[PDB]
Write a protein that binds this DNA or RNA. Structure first.
Ligand SMILES: [Zn+2]
Lengths: 126, 102, 171, 49, 121, 134, 454
RNA sequence: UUGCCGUUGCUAUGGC
């Protein structure tokens, strides 16, 4: 189960990768993608330029969590809920969030690179 | 103690012969011991010990079984006629050497 | 086989450390070989999922794949679905090798005792003495892994150390 | 090459007892006590956010 | 509700008895009522099988209270004779226990039977 | 024009369409048993090779049948062995895992194109498909 | 519909494989192989013999002369007989004694001839598995087998030995151990008109021997539980059944290959089949066999099934669910320990813990139309198989055998249209492998002989 | 008709 954020969705649509099919042929496993309410709040706050990205995040195949905090800082929410539990893949393309996630141990990181998704800290990919 | 099993016994009257496949069974022995096998074959069939012959021995992996090709003759003279000369050199009585030159 | 993408990240090093220590492996090539052909297996099962229901390829190659995976023994009899082939992984494959199985059946005291029993030929599945440790026993050869009858841990004549000690103590 | 990975895995799983607390297998005999001390000030539990 | 309540039907009974036979071959089965309660209070037990037709029934009904205390699955097979025959001994047994082991070659089968009898229970 | 004797059209091919997924489904739904070996007898070089695949034990059975049938050992013919034995054993240790070959799942070859979707009974009429059902 | 599409695509596949009755219908390779068939020898052992003795309804049933000769041996275990082409029989017990009988005095009870009793004297002085070459049995002789020619009887049991005794003196001529620790033999069968023995040993192993050469032919592997029963006919095929793996295998012993046959009755689909309008259920353990002819055999299960199997069908052809009844439920004075009959009846759960008798002996007369089943219901059953070979049916019962029937086999007399047989059945008060058997209801350790006629 | 023991038959049963 993979936590998505907003620039990962934007780079997915910019590189024409499907979310669940890109995840499946990246990991060769069955993926459950998760949009937290703060990532969804960030996509809605991005305005009416990003309508395509918002209604591709509105997808019944993409399940969605319910964050319980004030504010819509998705990087704080993703970092907290991943270092609490260590049962999550983080799909992101922010340089700062990528550095945070790859500094906390045991957390695999997925990112749009080239024309498909790549995964780094998951040691069983083939 | 070796053990013997004949299978698919046919008769060749044109070659005055009776031929078959030979499942040779030697648990905790090395291999077929072909002269002793000709003895055992010549006593399970009739006498003709210089007219019984085996040639095609393949032991399977781990030992125990080996499949050979058994052909038994009546009339040791016509066995000497019909068998090839290298098998006669191997088992019976014939010995003619080739002239070693060039 | 083939090397992985990032072969030197610390998760991969601790992964291979746990795998080689828990299964008594000699080097990285065991993990890399069995993971390469597992990658082929579930890269195929991914495409069998990306095609639809009632596709001929999906029906026939899917039940073929899960039945020969069940007969290799990495997949149990009741999960006859094709997403469990994706849930499959590498230690499910190298729990099936003969060293792991000899230790789990208890003919040996550790995986290293199992490896030296196998390479010293005291272990025979069925009829034949198997002597390499990475053998991938199947679900029907799972219960005939026993000591070889040609071996002193079976019932055979004792080896050279035992008989030389018996002779020297008889002297 | 095999004995080296046997003895660097034994070292690793002896270091793992230092970082985590490893489930050793439950209560062996009579419960003797904690055998190493009880700290009433330390709380080794993960707080949320 | 009888006293020997969570009885298994015939398919679950044969699944249970097959994994009992395999654990008895793999030295992972402690058989008999007081050996079962010994391994139960020691905590090395994955599930306990009681037979629901021995000549008293409270003789093994002492064990569901122990399993409840320590949260261990317990299941009632309807034949002590078939249970002893599966255990591999020349007598009927009335209770048996699958001890825990992680170097065990039947762990997936034991876990599947545990899940089946726990959804029963 | 005129006829010309064509052994390539009255020769038993039966191998352009022999697919292992269809054959496995037929072995599953066959309702007659399958002649499997006593379990140790089919591993090959003490485990240095594989177990052996189903096609390899079929071919071995054919070779031993021909062997006993006309009393002749086969040989170590160099060109054919340097092709077939080495390429066969290397793809065996590539794709045969535990007596089961998984090479097919890594191979593009359409099932329904060649081996299914009948060509003679194509039923290109509504009336012909109606009579083929009824 | 996916299974419909699977069946349809498989049908199209087989049609395409055919793609890749006239007046001339001859094939060159078939007729050449038939010329080789005309050339070959040995149309003797390899008869694929069908059922040529159709006499099931013919002979009498209900008025057999039944003599239950009780013997003083605790828990008789096996029975071996012999006919040349005087007749001797053999019994063996859990008291480590083999006993020779004469049986040819057909109208009366059998006659004891000779004991051969092992004991604690024969325990080896080594505890080492290959110097097990003593001359007697020290533990639990389970099976006897007489030679088809009658020079020897060969017996063995839980002391992992095969002792071959001479017939005329009951003397141990040769000892062959099974060379490993769990190598207990459980069933023995000679192939008919021969000197080749097939023993089924609890190592999931089947050993084969030539007795007059004192040699072992072939060890053949492949069951998954202990090989509880074995059966053979004149062909070099064999049929074994392992206990709890619920499969019966038959072995081409020269080829060392097999055909497996699993069970597969489920109370879900069976109770639905009855629900279209009932105490029957799944399967415990396939226990006993007898090869009726060289195309069919019959299996006795642990839930009282008797099943009839062909050589050409994995799933069985015919079942018979309850073959000896369901056991008497444990009494209310021996279930609960309360005071009132209402709670002691509530501790029976209705019908849920009624267990069927399990068929512990089955014997098909070779190539005939009739087989005999036995358990501790007290009454042997006689069944005949219908002439189309797709069913059998209960003819009658033989109700003079109180106890477990550890062995059934018959002894022939009379000519091609007028025949009389004595059915021997070893009767004990305890199963031939472990004890497990309570409610010993008037049993005795004897030999139930019946004389059936016409 | 057997390891004992009981009815036994002048042969069948039943308790360990
Ligand atoms: Zn949030």
């Amino acid at each position: 189960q993979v936590l998505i954020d907003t620039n990962f969705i934007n780079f997915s649509i910019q590189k024409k990768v499907d979310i669940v099919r890109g995840m499946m042929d990246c990991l060769l496993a069955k993926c459950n993608p998760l949009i937290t309410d703060c990532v969804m709040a960030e996509l809605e706050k991005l305005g009416p330029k990003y309508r395509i990205a918002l209604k591709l995040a509105r997808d019944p195949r993409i399940k969605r969590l319910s964050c319980s905090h004030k504010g819509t800082y998705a990087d704080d929410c993703l970092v907290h809920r991943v270092l609490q539990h260590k049962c999550y893949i983080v799909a992101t393309n922010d340089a700062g969030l990528k550095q945070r996630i790859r500094k906390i141990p045991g957390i695999p990181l997925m990112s749009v690179g080239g024309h498909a998704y790549v995964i780094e800290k998951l040691p069983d990919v083939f | 103690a070796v053990t013997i099993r004949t299978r698919k016994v046919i008769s060749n009257p044109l070659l005055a012969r009776k031929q078959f496949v030979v499942d040779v069974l030697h648990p905790n022995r090395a291999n077929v011991s072909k002269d002793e096998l000709r003895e055992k074959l010549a006593e399970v069939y009739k006498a003709e010990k210089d007219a019984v012959s085996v040639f095609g021995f393949r032991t399977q992996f781990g030992g125990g079984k080996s499949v050979g090709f058994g052909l038994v003759y009546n009339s040791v003279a016509e066995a000497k006629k019909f068998e090839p000369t290298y098998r006669l050199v191997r088992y019976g009585l014939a010995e003619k050497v080739e002239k070693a030159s060039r | 086989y083939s090397t992985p993408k990032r072969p030197y990240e610390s998760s991969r090093l601790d992964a291979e450390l746990k795998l080689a220590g828990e299964f008594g492996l000699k080097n990285k090539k065991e993990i890399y070989r069995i993971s390469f052909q597992l990658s082929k297996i579930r890269r195929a099962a991914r495409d069998l999922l990306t095609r639809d229901e009632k596709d001929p390829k999906r029906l026939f190659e899917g039940n073929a794949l899960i039945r020969r995976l069940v007969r290799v023994g990495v997949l149990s009899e009741d999960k006859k679905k094709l997403d469990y082939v994706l849930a499959l992984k590498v230690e499910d494959f190298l729990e099936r090798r003969l060293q792991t199985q000899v230790y789990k059946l208890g003919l040996a005291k550790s995986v290293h005792h199992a490896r030296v029993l196998i390479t010293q030929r005291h272990i025979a599945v069925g009829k034949q003495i198997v002597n390499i440790p990475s053998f991938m026993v199947r679900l029907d050869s799972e219960k005939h892994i026993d000591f070889a009858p040609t071996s002193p841990f079976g019932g055979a004549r004792p080896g050279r150390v035992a008989r030389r000690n018996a002779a020297r103590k008889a002297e | 090459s095999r004995v080296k990975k046997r003895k660097k895995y034994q070292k690793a799983q002896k270091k793992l007892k230092s970082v985590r607390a490893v489930y050793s297998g439950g209560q062996s005999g009579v419960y003797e006590g904690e055998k190493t001390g009880i700290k009433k000030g330390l709380t080794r539990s993960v707080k949320f956010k | 509700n009888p006293k020997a309540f969570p009885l298994a039907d015939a398919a679950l009974t044969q699944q249970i008895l097959d994994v009992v036979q395999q654990a008895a071959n793999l030295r992972q089965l402690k058989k008999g009522a007081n050996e079962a309660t010994k391994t139960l209070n020691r905590g090395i037990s994955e599930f306990i099988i009681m037979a629901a037709d021995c000549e008293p029934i409270e003789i093994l009904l002492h064990l569901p209270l122990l399993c409840e205390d320590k949260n261990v699955p317990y299941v009632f097979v309807p034949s002590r004779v078939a249970l002893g025959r599966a255990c591999g001994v020349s007598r009927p047994v009335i209770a048996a226990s699958i001890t825990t082991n992680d170097a065990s070659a039947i762990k997936t089968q034991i876990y599947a039977v545990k899940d089946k009898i726990e959804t029963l229970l | 024009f005129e006829d010309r004797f064509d052994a390539r059209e009255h020769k038993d091919r039966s191998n352009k369409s022999r697919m292992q997924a269809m054959e496995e489904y037929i072995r599953e739904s066959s309702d007659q048993p399958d002649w499997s070996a006593s379990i140790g007898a089919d591993i090959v070089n003490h485990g240095r090779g594989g177990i052996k695949s189903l096609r390899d034990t079929e071919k071995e059975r054919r070779v031993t049948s021909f062997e006993e049938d006309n009393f002749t050992r086969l040989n170590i013919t160099n060109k054919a062995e340097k092709r077939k034995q080495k390429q066969r054993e290397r793809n065996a240790r590539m794709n045969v895992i535990g007596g089961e070959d998984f090479g097919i799942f890594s191979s593009k070859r359409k099932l329904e194109d060649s081996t299914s979707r009948r060509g003679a009974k194509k039923t290109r009429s509504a009336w012909d498909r109606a009579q083929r059902r009824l | 519909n996916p299974a419909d599409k699977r069946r349809r695509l498989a049908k199209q596949y087989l049609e395409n494989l055919k793609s890749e009755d006239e007046y001339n219908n001859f094939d060159a390779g078939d007729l050449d192989k038939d010329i080789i068939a005309s050339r070959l020898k040995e149309d003797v052992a390899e008869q694929q013999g069908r059922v040529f003795r159709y006499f099931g309804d013919k002979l009498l049933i209900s008025e057999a002369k039944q003599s239950f000769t009780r013997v003083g041996e605790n828990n008789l275990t096996c029975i071996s007989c012999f006919q040349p082409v005087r007749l001797f029989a053999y019994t063996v017990s859990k008291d480590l004694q083999l006993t020779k009988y004469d049986i040819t005095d057909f109208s009366k009870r059998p006659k004891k001839l000779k004991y051969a009793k092992g004991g604690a004297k024969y325990i080896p002085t080594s505890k080492h598995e290959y110097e097990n070459t003593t001359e007697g049995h020290y533990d639990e002789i389970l099976t006897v087998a007489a030679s088809p020619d009658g020079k020897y009887v060969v017996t063995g049991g839980r002391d992992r030995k095969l002792i071959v005794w001479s017939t005329e003196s009951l003397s141990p001529v040769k000892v062959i151990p099974t060379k490993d620790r769990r190598g207990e033999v459980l069933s023995l069968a000679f192939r008919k008109n021969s000197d080749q023995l097939y023993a089924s040993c609890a190592d999931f192993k089947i050993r084969t021997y030539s007795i007059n050469q004192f040699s072992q032919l072939e060890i053949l592997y492949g069951h998954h539980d202990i090989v509880e029963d074995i059966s053979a006919l004149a062909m070099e095929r064999c049929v074994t059944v392992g206990a709890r793996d619920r499969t019966a295998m038959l072995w081409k012993i020269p080829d060392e290959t097999r055909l497996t046959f699993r069970g597969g009755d489920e109370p879900q689909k069976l109770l639905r089949r009855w629900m279209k309008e009932p105490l029957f259920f799944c399967e415990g353990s396939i226990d006993v066999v007898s090869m009726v002819d060289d195309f069919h055999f019959i299996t006795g299960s642990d839930n009282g099934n008797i099943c009839l199997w062909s050589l050409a069908k994995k799933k069985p052809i015919f079942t018979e669910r309850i073959a000896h009844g369901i056991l008497p439920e444990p009494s209310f004075n021996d279930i609960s320990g309360e005071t009132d009959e209402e709670l002691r009846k509530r501790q029976l759960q209705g019908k849920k813990l009624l267990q069927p008798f399990w068929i512990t002996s089955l014997y098909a007369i070779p190539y005939s139309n009739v087989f005999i089943s036995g358990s501790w219901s007290g009454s042997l059953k006689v069944w005949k198989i219908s002439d189309n070979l797709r069913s059998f049916e209960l003819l009658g019962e033989l109700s003079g055998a109180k106890g477990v029937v550890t062995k059934i086999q018959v002894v022939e007399s009379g000519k091609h249209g007028k025949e009389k047989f004595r059915i021997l059945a070893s009767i004990a008060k305890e199963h031939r492998l472990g004890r497990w058997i309570a409610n010993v209801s008037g049993a005795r350790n004897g030999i139930y002989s019946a004389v059936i006629d016409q």
